[PDB]
């Protein structure tokens, strides 16, 4: 996990919230599963439309489903 | 011979579980020489014994 | 050297008591005792009991990380190292008070000091703990070099096949994992169902680079009754075949019989039928496709064909019988041969043909020999009679002992020896007809007349 | 007949070694822990000894070889499961990670 | 930029998971997707921290976040995902393990 990089993300965006020891490993466990659910839907949208190269609309249709489940 | 071919498998499974039970326990086994003899005995298979 | 030894005796005796409380002189005293580790070991060396004290402290984590790594870099032993020091040092690593970079320098110490230990009994008995350090990914080239040097036949286990195929599927192709499976195919090929390439790789640290190891040891890569069969490749020299001749398996090809002289001893005493028919089926196809006049007249392939016929003429003389492929090739090449283009390798190929009847040889050999004998040069005319005097050697050598080795037939052998009487008396009277006719061709030259009387010496 | 009676004497030496190493080092776990300043909720199912946990796992695998799966219940403790999973002793089912089994080492 | 090089490790994880070569402006869509997901990660934690009345992130709100996204269910727990997707150094510090004397090195 880039533990030095995740302290730079959490302080520049919201400079009032603190993180304890090994709390960023579950942030990295979230981000390993977020890209893996993004790449699964992008593989699903490419094989259903019979196009091998993943276009920008295959990422954008995956951005309307996977990011919708992230809010709560 | 069927009892031998099942007890060699039982001896192999228990001697390969028990060495990882020694390793996962984090116990200094070098101070006991009889337990050191058990740890040096656990490598030997049914052809050596 | 005694004052350097007595400074070491107060340094090892300070380290075995651990850190001494109520004393804030640890920045000066034990730093000076860390400086006594190098200048004894870089000049003189240490005894075997001085290695055993300092290795147990540096793997337990008493003085920190920066002190214990500087001990492991600069130790040079002068005597043998006991295996009981190797047994206890695993058990201090089983406590769990050790760091990551300290385990690197402990594993690099066992690589470089492997040849100075002659007790490899209890080190091989710790192989189950040596396999179980593969869960750490940062130590993974350092573990697998220790797994290479400590593997026996009983250490190759099928679940250890199964874990390393799972590590091949997760983190891919690495040269420390492919070289560990290359020894496992060198020891037990039946336990692995995944075949490996056989390409030229150095596989490890090799090729005598011990000065390059010591320059990179300062600060580099330290931070993260048997009725079965015997295998043919284990015959290295002469007495390995003398102990095992009654159990010898069959190879994957018959072209390796001519390569090894130890396999030429196996042909001398085995009179089995399908081991001679498969050798007939290979070498008849070798002489037919890779001959001279079937090619596009390459001088380099004719040199390799000359080098292949030098293997045949030493194999026919070591066996003392000619091969059944070789006399079948001369049945088809003597109408197709003119008299040159490796003449000396072709006239020695006719010299070691075994005995047959006289009426079978003369339409296939002696008609096509006499078409070239009276018409070529006199160096060919002398080389025919040098070939036929060696043909009169090996035919009369077989007939001299064929009487001795046959008590089986209860019939008298005077019809068989009388049938062999006119086969060889018409042999000498044909070459004697070749000798008195070629004298008239050259009109009494003495250079042919020396080799006619050498034929009647036989 | 002698060497099959010899390896049973190596078995009863090792099961006495298994009975004495786990008793002196891995005691009975108490469910009345972390009771300072909080009130964490546990069930009334009592935890057992890890030597009694491994006695079930060698009786599940070796008696019926076609079903080694053991359901994780309230009688088990999850660091006792993690000690069997870190060293590679036990393995979970990949379609459902609630059933553990004793992985045999012969293939 | 260090924000660009720190997100480029997850660009190479995105090329590894899809197993296809990806266009450069398509990877700029992913770096804008991870910029707004990390903004929504900080927005979901401040709802979870103001519900308890604190400004320091505790791991039980991280346990609650995967239960609402479907990553942790009644059959797949949080300890399944650590032992299969993270190495041995991260498995030691997160999951409690049992040792001699009933001692736990991540003691709670």
Swiss-Prot record, chain A:
Keyword annotations from UniProtKB, A to Z: Cell cycle, Cell division, Centromere, Chromosome, DNA-binding, Kinetochore, Mitosis, Nucleus
GO molecular function (one): protein heterodimerization activity
Location (main, coarse): nucleus
Record keyword DNA-binding present: yes
Tissue-level expression: Highly expressed in ovary, liver, lung and pancreas and to a lower extent in breast and gastrointestinal tract cancers; such as those of the colon, rectum and stomach. Overexpressed in high grade breast invasive tumors. Expressed in many cancer cell types.
Quaternary structure note: Heterodimer with CENPT; this dimer coassembles with CENPS-CENPX heterodimers at centromeres to form the tetrameric CENP-T-W-S-X complex, which is a subcomplex of the large constitutive centromere-associated network (CCAN, also known as the interphase centromere complex or ICEN). Interacts with NPM1.
Family membership: Belongs to the CENP-W/WIP1 family.
UniProt-recorded name of the protein: Centromere protein W
UniProt organism field: Homo sapiens (Human)
Entire-sequence positions represented here: 17 to 88 of 88
Curated annotation (Swiss-Prot), chain C:
UniProt modification remark: Sumoylated. Sumoylated form can be polyubiquitinated by RNF4, leading to its degradation. Desumoylation by SENP6 prevents its degradation.
Parts forming coiled coils: none
Annotated disulfide bonds: none
Keywords: Centromere, Chromosome, Nucleus, Ubl conjugation
Induction of the gene: By follicle-stimulating hormone (FSH).
GO biological process terms on file: CENP-A containing chromatin assembly; chromosome segregation; mitotic sister chromatid segregation; sex differentiation
Main location: nucleus
Cell location: Nucleus; Chromosome, Centromere
Gene Ontology CC terms, in alphabetical order: cytosol; inner kinetochore; kinetochore; nuclear body; nucleoplasm; nucleus
Summary of the function given for this chain in its UniProt record: Component of the CENPA-CAD (nucleosome distal) complex, a complex recruited to centromeres which is involved in assembly of kinetochore proteins, mitotic progression and chromosome segregation. May be involved in incorporation of newly synthesized CENPA into centromeres via its interaction with the CENPA-NAC complex. Required for the localization of CENPF, MAD1L1 and MAD2 (MAD2L1 or MAD2L2) to kinetochores. Involved in the response of gonadal tissues to follicle-stimulating hormone.
Subunit structure: Component of the CENPA-CAD complex, composed of CENPI, CENPK, CENPL, CENPO, CENPP, CENPQ, CENPR and CENPS. The CENPA-CAD complex interacts with the CENPA-NAC complex, at least composed of CENPA, CENPC, CENPH, CENPM, CENPN, CENPT and CENPU. Interacts with SENP6.
UniProt record similarity statement: Belongs to the CENP-I/CTF3 family.
From Swiss-Prot, chain D:
UniProt-recorded name of the protein: Centromere protein K
Gene that encodes it: CENPK
Cell compartment(s), UniProt: Nucleus; Chromosome, Centromere; Chromosome, Centromere, Kinetochore
Organism: Homo sapiens (Human)
Record disease entry: Chromosomal aberrations involving CENPK are a cause of acute leukemias. Translocation t(5;11)(q12;q23) with KMT2A/MLL1.
Species lineage: Eukaryota, Metazoa, Chordata, Craniata, Vertebrata
Tissues with expression: Detected in several fetal organs with highest levels in fetal liver. In adults, it is weakly expressed in lung and placenta.
Oligomer status and interactors: Component of the CENPA-CAD complex, composed of CENPI, CENPK, CENPL, CENPO, CENPP, CENPQ, CENPR and CENPS. The CENPA-CAD complex interacts with the CENPA-NAC complex, at least composed of CENPA, CENPC, CENPH, CENPM, CENPN, CENPT and CENPU. Interacts directly with CENPH.
Span covered, complete protein: 163 to 269 of 269
Function text: Component of the CENPA-CAD (nucleosome distal) complex, a complex recruited to centromeres which is involved in assembly of kinetochore proteins, mitotic progression and chromosome segregation. May be involved in incorporation of newly synthesized CENPA into centromeres via its interaction with the CENPA-NAC complex. Acts in coordination with KNL1 to recruit the NDC80 complex to the outer kinetochore.
Family: Belongs to the CENP-K/MCM22 family.
From Swiss-Prot, chain E:
Entry's localization field: Nucleus; Chromosome, Centromere; Chromosome, Centromere, Kinetochore
Top-level taxon in the UniProt lineage: Eukaryota
Domain notes: The largest part of the sequence forms an elongated and flexible stalk structure that is connected to a C-terminal globular domain with a histone-type fold.
Function of the molecule: Component of the CENPA-NAC (nucleosome-associated) complex, a complex that plays a central role in assembly of kinetochore proteins, mitotic progression and chromosome segregation. The CENPA-NAC complex recruits the CENPA-CAD (nucleosome distal) complex and may be involved in incorporation of newly synthesized CENPA into centromeres. Part of a nucleosome-associated complex that binds specifically to histone H3-containing nucleosomes at the centromere, as opposed to nucleosomes containing CENPA.
Annotated disorder: Short stature and microcephaly with genital anomalies: An autosomal recessive disease characterized by growth failure resulting in severe short stature, severe microcephaly, and delayed and dissociated bone age. Additional features include global psychomotor developmental delay, pubertal delay and genital anomalies.
Stated family: Belongs to the CENP-T/CNN1 family.
Name used for this protein in its record: Centromere protein T
Species: Homo sapiens
């Amino acid at each position: 996990a880039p533990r030095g990089f995740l302290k730079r993300v959490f302080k520049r965006k919201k400079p009032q919230l603190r993180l304890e020891k090994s709390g960023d490993l579950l942030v990295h466990l979230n981000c390993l599963l977020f890209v893996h659910r993004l790449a699964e839907e992008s593989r699903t949208n490419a094989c259903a439309s019979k196009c091998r190269v993943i276009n920008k609309e295959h990422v954008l249709a995956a951005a309307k489903v996977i990011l919708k489940k992230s809010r709560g | 011979r069927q009892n031998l071919q099942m007890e060699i498998k039982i001896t192999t499974v228990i001697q390969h579980v028990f060495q990882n039970l020694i390793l996962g326990s984090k116990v200094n086994w070098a101070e006991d020489p009889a337990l050191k003899e058990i740890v040096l005995q656990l490598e030997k298979n049914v052809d050596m014994m | 050297d005694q004052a350097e030894e007595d400074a070491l005796q107060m340094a090892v005796g300070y380290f075995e008591k651990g850190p001494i409380k109520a004393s804030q002189n640890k920045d000066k005293t034990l730093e000076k005792h860390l400086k006594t580790v190098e200048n004894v070991a870089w000049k003189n060396g240490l005894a075997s009991e001085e290695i055993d004290i300092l290795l147990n402290i540096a793997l337990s984590g008493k003085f920190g990380n920066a002190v214990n790594t500087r001990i492991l870099k600069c130790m040079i032993p002068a005597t043998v190292i006991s295996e009981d020091s190797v047994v206890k040092a695993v058990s201090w690593l089983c406590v769990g008070k050790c760091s990551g970079s300290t385990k690197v320098l402990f594993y690099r110490w066992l690589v470089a000091m492997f040849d100075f230990i002659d007790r490899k009994e209890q080190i091989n008995l710790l192989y189950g703990f040596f396999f179980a350090s593969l869960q750490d990914d940062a130590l993974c080239p350092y573990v697998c070099h220790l797994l290479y040097l400590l593997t026996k036949k009983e250490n190759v286990k099928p679940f250890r096949v199964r874990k390393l195929l799972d590590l091949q599927a997760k983190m891919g192709m690495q040269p420390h994992l492919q070289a560990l499976l290359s020894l496992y195919k060198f020891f037990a090929p039946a336990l692995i169902s995944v075949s490996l390439p056989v390409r030229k790789k150095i596989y490890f640290k090799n090729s005598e680079n011990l000065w390059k190891t010591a320059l990179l040891a300062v600060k580099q890569r330290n931070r993260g009754n048997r009725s079965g069969s015997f295998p043919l490749e284990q015959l290295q020299s002469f007495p390995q075949l003398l102990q095992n001749i009654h159990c010898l398996e069959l190879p994957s090809q018959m072209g390796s019989v001519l390569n090894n002289s130890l396999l030429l001893h196996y042909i001398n005493c085995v009179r089995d039928e399908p081991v001679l028919l498969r050798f007939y089926y290979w070498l008849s196809q070798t002489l037919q496709e890779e001959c001279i006049w079937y090619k596009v007249n390459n001088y380099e392939h004719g040199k390799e064909f000359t080098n292949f016929l030098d293997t045949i003429i030493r194999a026919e003389c070591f066996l003392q019988e000619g091969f059944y492929s070789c006399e079948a090739f001369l049945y088809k090449s003597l109408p197709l041969w003119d008299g040159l283009c490796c003449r000396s390798q072709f006239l020695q190929l006719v010299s070691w043909i075994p005995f047959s009847s006289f009426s079978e040889v003369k339409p296939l050999l002696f008609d096509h020999l006499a078409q070239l004998f009276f018409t070529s040069t006199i160096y060919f005319k002398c080389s025919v009679l040098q070939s036929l005097k060696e043909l009169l050697q090996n035919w009369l050598l077989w007939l001299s002992m064929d009487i001795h080795m046959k008590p089986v037939t209860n019939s008298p052998l005077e019809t068989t020896l009388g049938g062999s009487m006119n086969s060889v008396s018409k042999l000498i009277h044909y070459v004697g007809w070749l000798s008195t006719t070629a004298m008239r061709l050259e009109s009494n030259n003495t250079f042919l007349l020396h080799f006619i009387l050498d034929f009647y010496e036989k | 007949k002698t060497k099959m009676l010899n390896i049973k004497e190596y078995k009863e030496k090792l099961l006495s070694t298994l009975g004495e190493f786990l008793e002196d080092h891995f005691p009975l776990p108490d469910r009345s822990v972390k009771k300072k300043k909080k009130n964490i909720q546990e069930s009334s199912v009592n935890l057992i000894t890890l030597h009694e946990m491994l006695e079930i796992l060698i009786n599940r695998l070796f008696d019926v070889p076609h079903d080694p799966y053991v359901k994780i219940s309230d009688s088990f403790w999850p660091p006792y499961v993690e000690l069997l999973l870190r060293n590679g002793i036990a393995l979970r089912h990949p379609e459902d990670p609630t059933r553990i089994r004793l992985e045999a080492f012969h293939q | 930029d260090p924000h660009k090089a720190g997100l480029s490790h997850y660009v190479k994880l995105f090329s590894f998971y899809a197993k296809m070569p990806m266009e450069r402006k398509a990877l700029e869509m992913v770096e804008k997707c991870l910029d707004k997901y990390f903004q929504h990660l900080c927005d979901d934690l401040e709802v979870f921290a103001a519900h308890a009345g604190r400004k320091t992130v505790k791991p039980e709100d991280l346990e609650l976040l995967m239960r609402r996204q479907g990553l942790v269910t009644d059959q797949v727990s949080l300890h399944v995902l650590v032992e299969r997707h993270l190495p041995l150094e991260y498995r030691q510090l997160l999951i409690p393990c049992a040792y001699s004397g009933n001692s736990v090195f991540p003691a709670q």
